[PDB]
Amino acid sequence: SPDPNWELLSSLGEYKDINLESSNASNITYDLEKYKNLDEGTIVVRFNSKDSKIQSLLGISNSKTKNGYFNFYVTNSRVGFELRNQKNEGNTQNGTENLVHMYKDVALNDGDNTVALKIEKNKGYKLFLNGKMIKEVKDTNTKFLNNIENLDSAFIGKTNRYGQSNEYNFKGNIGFMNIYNEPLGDDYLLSKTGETK
Ligand SMILES: CC(=O)N[C@H]1[C@H]([C@H](O)[C@H](O)CO)O[C@@](OC[C@H]2O[C@@H](O)[C@H](O)[C@@H](O)[C@H]2O)(C(=O)O)C[C@@H]1O
């Protein structure tokens, strides 16, 4: 990754017009090899939710575990992500590491919102929403997808988990999702997310 970061970069993944009105997530597991070893990157999502519960925009997980997952989520009044690893499979809490839970209480538009998560390896994390950098966390030992063992699922609109776990099914539409292998420039993220001030 250069310093400063690129202001415009080709996406690793780009997904559009995902209809989640009946809360049936979009399986993007075919792209999993692109993401599973990432130690940094950027995720940009345009969304409109019809619900107030915790809902995954993007869920990347080890479906053989309860708690081995990355969950980029929203509510009606909050955005954030969790990062958790689990070393033991099946119906158990054993071997769970709760790595990061970063979130911010926010005002959302009633219509479309645009959010971004920026991860800079061993620098930190930033959240953007509707043209603002809403939260920055400095961290000299960052964790991301490469820290979750045996990933096997990637979904837009849910997190694929073992057994009876809460999959955080999203209800509404996702206009777009763009995933990058590098941290993008703040100015790019401010303008891009800013399209839905
Ligand atoms: C983003 C978030 O807060 N994730 C939590 C999650 C949610 O809060 C919950 O699923 C929303 O309904 O809860 C997690 O723990 C589940 C666990 O909670 C205990 O209090 C309860 O006794 C258990 O039966 C079980 O529901 C989850 O894994 O889903 C933790 C996660 O970090």
TrEMBL record:
Instruction: Please report the stretch or stretches of sequence annotated as the Glycoside hydrolase family 33 N-terminal domain.
Output: 11-197
Tell me where the transmembrane regions lie: none
Binding residues annotated for Ca(2+) 3, in chain numbering: N160, R161, E167
Q: Which organism is it from?
A: Clostridium perfringens (strain ATCC 13124 / DSM 756 / JCM 1290 / NCIMB 6125 / NCTC 8237 / Type A)
Protein's name according to its UniProt entry: exo-alpha-sialidase
Q: Which domain of life is it from?
A: Bacteria
Quote the record's binding site residues for Ca(2+) 2. D139, N141
Please tell me where Ca(2+) 1 binds in this chain. Answer: N48, S49, D110
Give the UniProt family note: Belongs to the glycosyl hydrolase 33 family.
